[PDB]
């Protein structure tokens, strides 16, 4: 892998590049491939540079210096425009489409919310998994809201503080681990009034131990 | 009135050669020189100018 | 220890009685046989050697794993031994035939915990992937994956 | 590899993340280079984790750092080359030990916590 | 052991990268003095 | 392998080409080490690469010898080497019975300096008096043209035959 050279040689290399460019430009101008650089002039330099020639036709001279200013500003603006490709192309396809590198292992977080009736929270949560491209499953039951989110590690890190610190009845991640392959499909909701209907749907993807852990944690909290 | 000038060729070869990778290793320097056939050094030709000569030589090939 | 030496010490002396050498890499696991004669030492150099209290010689330097053998687990009867490696592969070798029987695949990280159940069929292997997979010696499949911690 | 006395020695996967964190702490003025400064940070209790190199030939010059971390309950991890660690820390000279300190409301809190978690599950 | 040169982007020996960074950024106008 | 040198001969201002002379480092390691300085000096005098560069052949006896390489005096009287003065002969196993062989030219025993003499023919009288520093593997036409140069009194060539460039091949 590469190494990160320090700021001293950063400045040194930048100075080498700029001096290289300046000397190459000066050699080309000495050859004459481009005209010698006309003195850059502003309003404050208007009478310093061209004043003697600016007395005869002042408005022409100020028009010329403003034209030079406009040409410089236009060169800058269209240089930015030529360099401006990530603004739209990357925006969401090359600057926000990452997927958290979930190729060899999918981080899975199983949370148990005691109260999740609010559709707002559900909507936001699902919405939060759509932009992060994280898979998930949510089973609703009597005082047991199991949510198994399987996605990338960055999406699992961003969703850990979303359900614990950004959304409010308590939510606790009962199991945080990785898997060899993805088990759950898209983020869909399904109502299960009985534990058998949730356990049969969890047995379709082999996630019956996630519901069995939540059913054991919901009974251990009622003792003490 | 004819052109009769290849000095622009000299500038273009200089600017191409300035953007030509040269190993910072004298060993590589001399290995590449033996690959092309140039001597290890000239009388009183130190390492910096050895690398510079290597750069000037691979500017052509 | 991590020097590859196996120190056998008594319950009365402060010095180790027997020094079993023959390994340069760090010895990962050292577990005696349930009978007491054999001794299986699995090291981090993709090897698991077998010694004895009668001869102190290399009996079975069982290789096969792509990475180092972290944990080893012999059966209660002593007929089989399940060795877990650092490449998410667990080989259940036979101590009567000298061949592998069960491949304990299905985990992501290394199998840090291996211990055969005294029921004679169940074998629970907990790995570093925050899960513990149970297998059966007769069903020859994964029983249950428990998210322990 | 080169040195058997390398307990938390990390491989070439999270080493890149470790060096990225070191560079970011350099940009934020959030590290102390050198074994002596790492030891001072450990003594002051403000060190969060220290990274050393397994290329220092008398490793026992820096083998007191893991003991000090054990005393203070501080994550510690090794690398495979001192030159890479030194260059990543923001200095040209080979560095064999660097420390990452604390900052109130640091933008690097999440990544430093992730690095602490990753190291702590690699000891065995 | 191979590293990547920060200036040229080419595989380099890990043993030389120190003096490689010392000398690959050798300031060109130094040669005349 | 044996070290090979290169020297571009310039007679009268006209380049006659480069002459590749490989020094026998096995039979003469000291002469081969000195040739290195001749091919390229190093801080020799206050940090100056003084050597065989710029030297000229001061004696040209046609079909007999081409002696020169004196960078101190230029007339063949200069004696300089890497051993801080004159050095002794390495071995007498090499003979001057083959044309093109360049020996260390000297005025007697243990007087071998920067002066080198290429034998243009088989010199049996030069065997044992001087040790052969090397053999010319290429550039025999340039050596034959330098040996056939017009020489005035005391075998002094009237045309300037100097080495324009010298180095290690």
From Swiss-Prot, chain A:
It comes from the Eukaryota. Highly expressed in retina, liver, kidney and blood. Detected at lower levels in heart and brain. It is found in: Nucleus; Nucleus speckle. Ubiquitinated. Undergoes 'Lys-63'-linked polyubiquitination by PRPF19 and deubiquitination by USP4. 'Lys-63'-linked ubiquitination increases the affinity for PRPF8 and may regulate the assembly of the U4/U6-U5 tri-snRNP complex. Residues 1-115 are annotated as: Mediates interaction with SART3. Signal peptide: none annotated. Plays a role in pre-mRNA splicing as component of the U4/U6-U5 tri-snRNP complex that is involved in spliceosome assembly, and as component of the precatalytic spliceosome (spliceosome B complex). Component of the precatalytic spliceosome (spliceosome B complex). Component of the U4/U6-U5 tri-snRNP complex, a building block of the precatalytic spliceosome (spliceosome B complex). The U4/U6-U5 tri-snRNP complex is composed of the U4, U6 and U5 snRNAs and at least PRPF3, PRPF4, PRPF6, PRPF8, PRPF31, SNRNP200, TXNL4A, SNRNP40, SNRPB, SNRPD1, SNRPD2, SNRPD3, SNRPE, SNRPF, SNRPG, DDX23, CD2BP2, PPIH, SNU13, EFTUD2, SART1 and USP39, plus LSM2, LSM3, LSM4, LSM5, LSM6, LSM7 and LSM8. Interacts directly with PRPF4. This is U4/U6 small nuclear ribonucleoprotein Prp3. It comes from Homo sapiens (Human). The gene is PRPF3. The chain holds residues 436 to 683 of 683 of the full protein.
From Swiss-Prot, chain C:
WD repeats lie at residues 22-61, 64-103, 106-145. It is found in: Nucleus; Nucleus speckle. It comes from the Eukaryota. Component of the precatalytic spliceosome (spliceosome B complex). Component of the U4/U6-U5 tri-snRNP complex, a building block of the precatalytic spliceosome (spliceosome B complex). The U4/U6-U5 tri-snRNP complex is composed of the U4, U6 and U5 snRNAs and at least PRPF3, PRPF4, PRPF6, PRPF8, PRPF31, SNRNP200, TXNL4A, SNRNP40, SNRPB, SNRPD1, SNRPD2, SNRPD3, SNRPE, SNRPF, SNRPG, DDX23, CD2BP2, PPIH, SNU13, EFTUD2, SART1 and USP39, plus LSM2, LSM3, LSM4, LSM5, LSM6, LSM7 and LSM8. Interacts directly with PRPF18, PPIH and PRPF3. It is linked to Retinitis pigmentosa 70: A retinal dystrophy belonging to the group of pigmentary retinopathies. Retinitis pigmentosa is characterized by retinal pigment deposits visible on fundus examination and primary loss of rod photoreceptor cells followed by secondary loss of cone photoreceptors. Patients typically have night vision blindness and loss of midperipheral visual field. As their condition progresses, they lose their far peripheral visual field and eventually central vision as well. This is U4/U6 small nuclear ribonucleoprotein Prp4. It comes from Homo sapiens. The chain holds residues 300 to 448 of 522 of the full protein.
From Swiss-Prot, chain D:
Changing residue 76 to A: Reduces U4 snRNA-binding by about 50%. Residues 32-44 are annotated as: Interaction with U4 snRNA and U4atac snRNA. It comes from the Eukaryota. It is found in: Nucleus; Nucleus, Nucleolus. Keywords: Acetylation, mRNA processing, mRNA splicing, Nucleus, Phosphoprotein, Ribonucleoprotein, RNA-binding, Spliceosome. InterPro entries: eL8/uL1-like (IPR050257), H/ACA_rnp_Nhp2-like (IPR002415), Ribosomal_eL30-like_sf (IPR029064), Ribosomal_eL8-like_CS (IPR004037), Ribosomal_eL8/eL30/eS12/Gad45 (IPR004038), Ribosomal_eL8/Nhp2 (IPR018492). Residues 92-124 are annotated as: Important for U4 snRNA-binding. Part of the small subunit (SSU) processome, first precursor of the small eukaryotic ribosomal subunit. During the assembly of the SSU processome in the nucleolus, many ribosome biogenesis factors, an RNA chaperone and ribosomal proteins associate with the nascent pre-rRNA and work in concert to generate RNA folding, modifications, rearrangements and cleavage as well as targeted degradation of pre-ribosomal RNA by the RNA exosome. Involved in pre-mRNA splicing as component of the spliceosome. Binds to the 5'-stem-loop of U4 snRNA and thereby contributes to spliceosome assembly. Belongs to the eukaryotic ribosomal protein eL8 family. This is NHP2-like protein 1. It comes from Homo sapiens.
UniProtKB/Swiss-Prot annotation, chain F:
It is found in: Nucleus speckle; Cytoplasm. Its EC number is 5.2.1.8. It catalyses: [protein]-peptidylproline (omega=180) = [protein]-peptidylproline (omega=0). Its main location: nucleus. One of its GO terms (molecular function) is cyclosporin A binding. One of its GO terms (cellular component) is cytoplasm. Inhibited by cyclosporin A. One of its GO terms (biological process) is protein folding. Residues 6-168 form the PPIase cyclophilin-type domain. Keywords: Acetylation, Chaperone, Cytoplasm, Isomerase, mRNA processing, mRNA splicing, Nucleus, Rotamase, Spliceosome. The keyword Transmembrane does not apply. Belongs to the cyclophilin-type PPIase family. PPIase H subfamily. PPIase that catalyzes the cis-trans isomerization of proline imidic peptide bonds in oligopeptides and may therefore assist protein folding. Participates in pre-mRNA splicing. May play a role in the assembly of the U4/U5/U6 tri-snRNP complex, one of the building blocks of the spliceosome. May act as a chaperone. Interacts directly with PRPF4. Part of a heteromeric complex containing PPIH, PRPF3 and PRPF4 that is stable in the absence of RNA. Component of the U4/U6-U5 tri-snRNP complex composed of the U4, U6 and U5 snRNAs and at least PRPF3, PRPF4, PRPF6, PRPF8, PRPF31, SNRNP200, TXNL4A, SNRNP40, DDX23, CD2BP2, PPIH, SNU13, EFTUD2, SART1 and USP39. Heterodimer with PRPF18. This is Peptidyl-prolyl cis-trans isomerase H. It comes from Homo sapiens. The lineage of its organism: Eukaryota, Metazoa, Chordata, Craniata, Vertebrata.
